[PDB]
């Protein structure tokens, strides 16, 4: 039972460089594909009233500059105000700090007190609490703005002054014993703080556009939806008849060989592109077949799958399917997702079955959301009722799902009723 150089065949393989190019041709999205396809089209010669003058809109910075133009500053104050308002984000909080602004001005005469005077002058502009250094001096401006007649104002000012972490950690008991403040009569003061419009500069303009492009289409024909490719998005190449009908006529060997080689390259490229489209269509049809339940019933009713499960259903390889299913967005009546989004890790449940990770994550989302606000549900209890459902995932996986879901811990979301 030895070390010896031995040899026995059971496999086969072969490949050429242009075949490598053709097999990497299907790894990339269509919009990025069209660039390289246009590049090859440029090289190969035998291959191949409207609304205008929109309106100008008023953003936050333009509005603030407009208001600066009608306020009585000096020239130096105007330059400082222009710099300050230039250093303003969409949310309404200035990005760079005051000493950075002073350095940007770069004047010996200019001082921190002068810059503070100008900034506080422009703090009272139409979006209240705009151009604030951080959250601490944005809520305070509006609290000071509100008339003294409304109650709990002093309480709200005391909390917002130097108890910001005390409120952020939702540690109401320590907040009480720190402030010496009233029991459950602080709730309306906290609510007053809540109703204070954080991020005030956002509301100057809120238009967001629609940017969706579908690669694969699925439609419900009264059960067992059939999948079609995007006719407009798909690329296509057509041979050129003029140049295909002049390779034989040419009597020069150079021209003849040139046309022959370019014909060969163009036909190979067309064949490779058609094969890529066919492979993508077949893969999409098979994955939609194996995911018919989820489209009907929702994310939490998703069967876990691996690339092996979808590769065995076809004659392609796991690597081939992995290359095809990158940067492909399929459109469904429920919405737009990615082909790579369907594949997920599996966890074993009670009764021998397995549940998909994304399904359990969505179930955790809805279960956590539908909870009493006074008593939060922790990760251990989440594991407990998941085991009652029969899923029995570990508390570590529960915590990982909750963290990836961006929900803060249970002790962090506790709040007064």
């Amino acid at each position: 039972m030895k070390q010896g150089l031995q040899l026995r065949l059971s496999q086969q393989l072969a490949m050429t460089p242009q075949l490598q190019q053709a097999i990497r041709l299907l790894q990339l999205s269509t919009l990025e594909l069209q660039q390289e396809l246009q590049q090859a089209l440029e090289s190969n010669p035998l291959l191949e009233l409207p609304v205008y003058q929109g309106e100008t809109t008023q953003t936050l910075q333009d509005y603030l500059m407009w208001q600066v133009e009608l306020t009585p500053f000096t020239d130096t104050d105007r330059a400082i105000a222009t710099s300050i308002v230039d250093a303003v984000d969409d949310t309404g909080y200035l990005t760079i700090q005051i000493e950075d602004i002073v350095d940007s001005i770069g004047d010996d005469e200019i001082g921190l007190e002068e810059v503070e005077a100008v900034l506080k002058r422009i703090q009272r502009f139409d979006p209240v609490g705009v151009a604030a250094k951080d959250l601490r001096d944005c809520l305070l401006i509006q609290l000071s703005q509100f008339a003294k007649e409304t109650p709990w104002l002093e309480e709200a000012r005391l909390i917002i002054s130097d108890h910001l972490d005390l409120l952020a950690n939702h540690d109401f008991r320590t907040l009480m014993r720190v402030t010496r403040l009233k029991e459950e009569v602080l709730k309306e003061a906290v609510n007053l703080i809540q109703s204070l419009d954080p991020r005030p500069g956002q509301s100057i303009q809120t238009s967001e556009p629609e940017y969706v492009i579908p690669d694969v289409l699925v439609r419900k024909v009264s059960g067992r939806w059939t999948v079609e490719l995007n006719a407009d998005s798909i690329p296509r190449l057509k041979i050129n008849q003029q140049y295909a009908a002049m390779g034989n006529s040419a009597r020069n060997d150079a021209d003849g060989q040139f046309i022959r080689s370019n014909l060969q390259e163009a036909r190979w490229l067309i064949k490779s592109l058609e094969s890529r489209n066919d492979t993508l269509l077949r893969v999409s049809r098979c994955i939609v077949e194996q995911q018919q339940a989820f489209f009907e019933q929702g994310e939490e009713y998703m069967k876990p799958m691996v690339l092996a499960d979808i590769a065995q259903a076809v004659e392609m390889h796991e690597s081939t399917i992995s290359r095809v299913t990158t940067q492909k967005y399929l459109h469904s009546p429920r919405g737009i997702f990615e082909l790579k989004y369907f594949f997920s890790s599996h966890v074993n449940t009670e009764g021998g079955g397995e549940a998909s990770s994304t399904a359990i994550r969505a179930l955790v989302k809805k279960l956590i959301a539908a909870e009493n606000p006074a008593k939060p549900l922790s990760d251990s209890k989440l594991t407990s009722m998941l085991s009652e459902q029969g899923i029995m995932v570990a508390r570590r996986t529960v915590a990982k799902y909750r963290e990836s879901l961006s929900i803060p811990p249970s002790n962090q979301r506790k709040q007064l009723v």
Binding site: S83, D86, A87, I96, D100, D103, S104
Partner: protein, 100 residues
């Protein structure tokens, strides 16, 4: 896009002082050009004042001349517009020189 229509490094910067890459984004930089992307840090109103050019490797005629009521090329060469037009589209093969 990079080196195309509606591009940066030509036609000026984009909506604000920030460069395309993301670095060098403030009024503190007033005329500098980033290294990862060549974008002058100036106002975006300059985007309507900066023009580019196309090399056009092969020469090309100008249709405003040689196709107005008089033809400027025709009057310069004493050559009629019909032959000018036939030569300007690769079916006439005019002679340049040759005295021998």
């Amino acid at each position: 896009e990079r080196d195309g229509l509606f591009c940066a490094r030509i036609f000026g910067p984009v909506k604000d002082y920030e460069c395309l890459c993301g670095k060098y984004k403030r009024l503190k930089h007033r005329g500098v050009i980033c290294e990862k992307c060549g974008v002058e840090v100036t106002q975006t109103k300059v985007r309507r004042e900066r023009m580019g050019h196309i090399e056009l490797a092969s020469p090309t005629a100008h249709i405003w001349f040689l196709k107005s009521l008089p033809s400027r090329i025709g009057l310069l060469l004493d050559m009629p517009l019909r032959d000018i037009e036939r030569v300007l589209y690769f079916e006439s093969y005019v002679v340049i020189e040759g005295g021998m």
